[PDB]
Amino acid sequence: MLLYKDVISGDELVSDAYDLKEVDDIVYEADCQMVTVKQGGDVDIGANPSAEDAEENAEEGTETVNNLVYSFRLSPTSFDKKSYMSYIKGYMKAIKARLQESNPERVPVFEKNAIGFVKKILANFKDYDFYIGESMDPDAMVVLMNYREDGITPYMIFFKDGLVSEKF
């Protein structure tokens, strides 16, 4: 029920309606489940000439999708290996300033903890993928999608430093 949004440019990055766990480091984890819904194509809010919506006569088009991405229309975008270093570097520094203006005591704990997680993320930045909200900003809240140690549990992480809690 809790709603967490970013102030830099995340806009509703995740919520507790699913489940959130903060790792000893400084990030939250919102688990997502798969649900089957009847979708008949969308392609943005308008962008098609003429169609029939028939395809076959033995299946309409049921597609399972995460409940967090569907409710928050999460939008995953492609990225570059070297481009990732520039986004995490200029983004980490951006937060460093937000602490100095708000809480300067979070500058050191945030640097050491965030530095450790970044080192374990580069080991497989591809397996963590890179998501982005409708804001379309490579310097806003960045969420990564990774499967637990099992693989049957899809979960994403949201930097707690750039995540606030909102009560209904």
49, two tokens: 């000439």
Q: Which of 158, 168, 162, 167 is nearest to 30 (CA)?
A: 158
Question: What domains appear along the chain, each with residue ranges and CATH number?
Answer: 1-168 (2.170.150.10)
Distance CA 49, CA 99 (A): 50
Partner residues linked to 143 by β-bridges: 158
Full DSSP string of 121-150: HHTTTTTT--EE-TT--TTS--EEEEE-SS
Question: DSSP state, 1?
Answer: -
Distance CA 145, CA 156 (A): 4
Residue type for 139, please? Answer: D
Plot region of 163 (φ>0 → left; ψ -120 to 50 → alpha; else → beta): beta
Tell me which H or E stretch contains 100.
helix 81-101
Task: Report CA Rg, the chain.
Answer: 18
Residue 18: φ, ψ to 5°: -100, -55
158, two tokens: 């949201």
